[model samples]
Target chain A: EEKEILWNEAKAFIAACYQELGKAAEVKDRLADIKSEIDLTGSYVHTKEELEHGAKMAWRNSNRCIGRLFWNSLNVIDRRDVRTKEEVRDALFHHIETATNNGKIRPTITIFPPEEKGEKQVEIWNHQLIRYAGYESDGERIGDPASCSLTAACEELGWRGERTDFDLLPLIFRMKGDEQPVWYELPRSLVIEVPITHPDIEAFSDLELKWYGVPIISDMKLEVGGIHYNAAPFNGWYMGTEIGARNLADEKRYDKLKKVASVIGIAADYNTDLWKDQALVELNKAVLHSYKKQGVSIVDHHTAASQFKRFEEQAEEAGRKLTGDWTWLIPPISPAATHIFHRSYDNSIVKPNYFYQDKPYE
Target chain B: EEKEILWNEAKAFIAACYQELGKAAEVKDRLADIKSEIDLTGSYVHTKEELEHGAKMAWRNSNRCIGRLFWNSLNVIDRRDVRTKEEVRDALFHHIETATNNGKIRPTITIFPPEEKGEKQVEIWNHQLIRYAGYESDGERIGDPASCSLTAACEELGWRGERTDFDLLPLIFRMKGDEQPVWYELPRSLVIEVPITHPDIEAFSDLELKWYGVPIISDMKLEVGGIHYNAAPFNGWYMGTEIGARNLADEKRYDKLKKVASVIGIAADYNTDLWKDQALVELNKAVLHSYKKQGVSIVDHHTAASQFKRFEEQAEEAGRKLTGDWTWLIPPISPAATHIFHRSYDNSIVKPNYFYQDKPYE
Candidate 1:
């Protein structure tokens, strides 16, 4: 009974809090009407035309008020009282950093230099300073190094951050090409090393695992010579057969395997120059889908493919891991009785030479 | 330049006001949600389920808040802040009293009651007492007169104020049937004195004006059997002429005039015992239409009509006005239009008496 009384009190407290909140919301609604009237003519005097304008303004303001109230209330509850002390402290720090670094630090890598010849050189010099001149000791690494200079150039030119990938591509490519080809003399010169920052959170176990043909598992396999292979629990006999190439009577096994060897080889090479073209082809398909979903037409698929490959290469250099589990899954069609009439035809029939030559009979 | 600065400041002030009001409204919205949750469960909690319940509660609370805000705001602007307060006040009070005494009230009858019953009634009554009831002397009068008794009854039995005319009818009819009719016999009884209030603000006007064919003039003359009878201009005329007593022999005129007379007679003898049956017929039509539109089919027209008439009588005796318009005016169907495609064999008609009333050829 005591516990029940305490529970009721808590409920009452919350109810009172909510009641105040409701009154605030009503006040906000009325405020919207007042604001709308003011917005139309900066006056409270009502006329037919002003009132109509005020009504529309009032509606929009009310909608905005509702949205802001929700967002701010969520922020307060989630970031403050609902969280632990540590979480609250971290959030406060994060907010402080965000405020102080506002627009000074850029979040993106690909940067566009100014268009004017004079401004372009100055922007390039600034970019180099931000990207390579900054040191951890100086506390200048809050955001992307490449973006810091770009931000400065933006401020100078009074330009908003609206440039696309295409806008920066040509200049970046030219600059990269102009640099000395250090790989020809010392192969290790082109290698990049990234330190793991959260080592305590990441650990690896060496447990023997078997290959599973399920899409999530199968797609995780790295493809070599058109044949898929998993990393552990060796299936020696199957690997020895070179199944895909042998079935097609193709003698290009060495060439195809070399293209994907960096990803599938037993010992990691991390030297991906040779496989770049082939990797690009696969990457382009994903990029095309993304562009289509965003309602943007892909004008140059080749360029997009190359850019996607470069992005992947950079990500790998930054110690990011990629898993292939999403590529092989396919959903069943027409599972319901009435919908069973819509059958999915086998595409192998149209590509008999490419897909079915090794197995003529079912 | 000074004017521009002043305008800018005004704009800023309005914006600030809006922002503050918005915050207040948000609080109200949240409180309402809490209230609704409590209402639904008969208690309040801050759990996920309770929060969902609270959202519905908030909607009703917000509506109440809005009504209160409007009422208060109007009162402040019209009474406290106006420069011509006394002049406007006197004008309004005089108009109301004059209109009430002279019977120049629009429609003079209405249907909607002031409140819903049970839990809703208690909730609203509390709200009225706490927030709106005692704000002014007139406010107290407008609210419940027997406050302590009414509040006690509401708390114990969840009794709400009567809302519709139909709610009070049986007792009214019973009182009239009593031999003494004690309530009706008093010349200056409270039941006969109070004026009906118009819910919609647009319906009120000066005595010299006319609205929707109802006169607002002070006095009028009527000729009854060549004798002048003075009466209120807007009041209805009944029993002006008797059918068949004046042998005019013009059936069309007779029929049209009789229909008009019936409508007028119903209005004039609205509170009397003789017109009860005819009033039920009209009320039933309205009830049938209302129920059909609302998709509720439990009560048929006859039952609803009878109940409505009884309710009106009761409400009026309790010093409440049942104000609503229920007059129908439509042209009668011409004989030619009614028989446009009839059979030519008149000799084989079902009844020969129907043919005896044929008109002479034009």
Candidate 2:
């Protein structure tokens, strides 16, 4: 049953990917060879062209990603040939530097070995290639609360951090035939950060906030034409709200709304005064201003929504049913102001998509 | 088959209602009598106690309502005995005044005759008991765009309004056994309007914005124990964002974000400037401030979210499974800043609950 489902998924992805890439004339022969290979080996390998296009297709099918307007422009780094542990770690670092692009933040993905016979050939432990390490000290979190578990796991593996609020965590991965996970510190020069500053508020700089330039998500498995790239790390340019409205503003994260409100001189009377809401807008403005000032590639929620509208239109023109998770699609701040909030989407998952895999550390 | 399903639904509701009311001893007797009545006449009637508690239960089970914390306190006005068309109109006006409670709006519902067999014994056509009129003038809408269609329908019915931005639309309703709809102008003295003014922004008053104090939804069918009260009009105090974020700000509604932004002196560079988001917060603040200043009952989104959280906790304590529409529960402004946005809800419809009916004009 599993094999039959895998074959169906493979056929679906190949049919769509090849057709989209204007290889419709070769589909019949390609599918014939793929079916034969799957029948014999229970899986089939993708050609270089197929792999690249399939990854692009996977991004296009990502219902939760708002930046899918540039899905096809993603630079695919093929690292399937690398077989050693050290090489895998180094390849991820290369992905970080390449995707960061010295603050330009190119959309990029680096794929390692595909899983074989339900076994993961490579696994990544870090949620993102570059993320701040959290430290539990004196009953308070020094960094991201979201990273506490991962940070502790790295500590157990003999990796220590500077204990700063923005200390970058090391990459943790396991290669093929290796039972133990290895940790490698990210090169400081490769991890570009933008120190947040508000354009209008001078006192805002006192809060001292910063975030990584590129968000290279390093854990999700990339499924393409029956091949599962378990160690596929992907990146996209930042959306200002992702950092301002969520990462820094969420109570479970940095919880900076009160601090921001105080700096903006609107801290009192939380509920009625809408101190939180006012502070959120100012914080988001600061993120946008800072990112633009630093020449980092970041889109504001409004522009991103506008771009998504274009993407929706393009998908319609391409004769593809655009699916999306409404909750994830709507931005966190002033969502109703966006057209996306007024619309609904069918959240059906398409083939050749990225999927959440188990944490390597867990 | 219909009779069987109706009896089953009736029995289910009776069992729950009776148990909750500490009348478990009478449930068996009630069901026996109800089943006999249904078998004889194809439908049964609800007792006075059943009608009152059932309306409250409907409010409690309303998955889209964020004000469910005060469900039990709903003032249920029984108007089922009003047989004349004129009496029905008078009853509705009385219901409005009673729910309005001058400025302190009361959570109230006026239930008319329930549908007999397959026929609606009473029907109310207006989407709400109170709403602004729209006029097409010089190829541009002069009022709420949401009301354009309804306004056109009212004009067709020979109802004229004083062409203004906040003109009150007359109530359109038809009684049982009446094929024609009747229009009645709302008494201006009975209708309370709060002039919107920002606390800190003096120029905001120049816009001359105003909104009604109470929101009495009039068109939804209240289904309780297999009986449909098609003329059940309910009311609740307004949440500020419902007016500021949606009614006054939605593109298809008043679309006042741009105007508000201009008044606040931050109108250029729409996307990166986040003028829309900033305007939204200030507009909402004005709504809350004005309503509170005018001594009208209103709740801010943050307080509403907190109240909803308390409602959730209470439901858990009472061993009741709380069902909710997440989209409706979350306020339109700064949704993620609230705990309601972070949580998910099961949007399963539970009876007795409100259900949308087809528009009378449509």
Candidate 3:
């Protein structure tokens, strides 16, 4: 008789291996060597040069993987044919709960309409509240939407700040209309519950508003997930049409949708410039090297890369079928990988281009 | 038939002229010009050069004539034939009284014998006690010989610890039996007073013995002479010696002496390979320029190079008559000139040979 493979057991084994790889001595040594190498070679390297190289080699790889996973997962779970927002919300809740019970962190699952008028918009709304407890009342509130003024919502639930460190609540969006998403379908939300007492709070705050249209809501309260997921996603979409059409006499939802979709299409194209592809490859190399050096073969345990590739292909195919356009758009494979490396590597590479330059761009 | 010249009247006229010359505005202006000239030329002009083409030609001529008159008067009054210490003591007392009455501060007179052996050591003892009235007790019984140590006597008389802030004590030592009676006159005392309150007094007590054998003294008190004798002659022997010593020991004393005499001698040569004569000449030019720049004319009404020359001759003659050898040798006039120049002139033109080849002679 063939041996029964338990899903929980397999997941536990993979997680344990991942933990070991993360804590590997070889990883520590390699990191130290890389730091040393950077120090030595970076003597003549200006800040911009370093940032550029890091962004190309590391950030792109991680973001691409994240985009692939998110879009593919969305295509599988999305019930676009459902009649109302209630059904979409229920499907999202079920998917979240199932992933959680399976010992997996929240997997990215997006929903999109099968067909759309004009260019479709990728809208993401996190229906979750995350909060912190056990700290003093007078203590600093990690994520207070009341204090932020930018992204306060009334009739919709959004992500919240949590007291626990490390819990993440992400809401990804990838449009599959007459055209594929111009950028990767990486999770829009990167909700990391940074401890209020963290030394880097000031530094992180300094990094806020680099992406101006993105909303990072604070003071989210969650019940099921850990307290860490209490904070709102650091990156999310903001509706400009709603803000501009306050005095409109006509109340047409489809027209509003068309306007929003047009805006999203324009935004996606504009945001493509910010994406780094080369960095994704380098980031994958680094992660794999880390895992292999720790005597753990990610490929042997499960076909993670293949699974991700398949998901990317499915997302691309779905995008084409819906939009009747082939723009070579695909979802990113590694969400956490892309998110971490995109930030880490881009910060290390790209610099603000403040000087005037007349250059040809395609 | 010729009109008889009144000696007192003649003296009074000369004195008035001296006073006028001392306060001459022309002389002050000329001196200032000379200082500027020296700074420009980077060298000192000799007396011959000054007589020929100096900016202060008139003042220099007047100074020469006045210097001659002052020396002529000194020849008429100098009396060094006293046989007993009492007679010497009495002469000093009268001289001090006359000078003090004439508006001069009392000049302190100190005497040292041929050797610091046995009874000769008591010369300073007798001078301090019987002559100066520097006694610890009024009663003869309490102030017996056994109770007298110079240190103890000074302390008991309330002299010690009296001028705590004053680092120097002006006490001229008139050493007999030198090539000059005051061949090696030093205005300051040889003994350095180490405060009893010093923390390292015990550890440093032995070092004081080393200092005792040296020619230099660390501390000496100052004395300013009175009006009448303030210009020339300076009253009697004691008063004259005090005035001369004070003038010679003006902070520029060492450099002035080195200009006329060798700073390095058979007994104590500077630690250098450079010849003493060359060094002395260089130092003399520097000191002379300095004095001129400060408007401190060496040929002032009270003190002049001519007057020093006369004193030097007398002292050398006296020392020869007593010692019959160069055992108490007087420094040469050239060295004294060099000493004066080195100290009073600008140091840039008369730079000393800082590099030395050997240790100084002990």
| Model 3 lDDT tens row, B1-362 | 11112222223332333343453444444444445543564322223222112112111122112222232222112223444445444443444343333322222222222121111211222222211112234652221222234324444334442222221212222223422111111223322221111121233222111101111111111111100111011221221111122222222221122322233232223211112222222232333322333332232212333454454456366451111111011112111111121222111211000111211110
True contacts kept of each: 0.00, 0.85, 0.00
The lDDT values for all models are 0.22, 0.89, 0.25
Model 1, B46-104: lDDT tens digits are 33322222222221122111111111111101111122323323322332233333332
Residues A1-362, candidate 2, lDDT per residue (tens digit)? 76787788878877887888889889999989988988898888889899999899899989998888898898998888988887887788788888878887889989898998878888789999889987777887789988989999999989988898998998888766778788888888888899999998999999999998888888899999778888889999889999999999998899999999989988556598988989999999999999999989999998999999999999999888999999999999888988889999999998789999877664
User: How accurate locally is residue A101 in candidate 2, as Cα lDDT from 0 to 100?
Assistant: 80
**Candidate 1: where is the Cα deviation over 4 Å?**
A1-21, A24-29, A32-362, B1-362
Instruction: List, residue by residue over B149-193, the lDDT tens digit for candidate 2.
Output: 889888998998788998899988887677788889988888999
Residue A293 displacement (Å), model 1: 36
Put down candidate 1 lDDT per residue, A1-362, tens digits, no spaces: 43333333323322333343454344444444544644463323222322222222221222101111111111111121212323322332343233223222211111121112111111121211112111112643322233445344433344333332111110111122233111001112221111111111121111111111100000011111111111100000111011111211122211222332233222223211212222222222222332333332222222322333453354378453322111011101000101111122221211000110111011
Query: DockQ numbers for every candidate?
Result: 0.00, 0.87, 0.00
* Predicted model with the maximum DockQ: 2
Count: clashes, candidate 3: 97
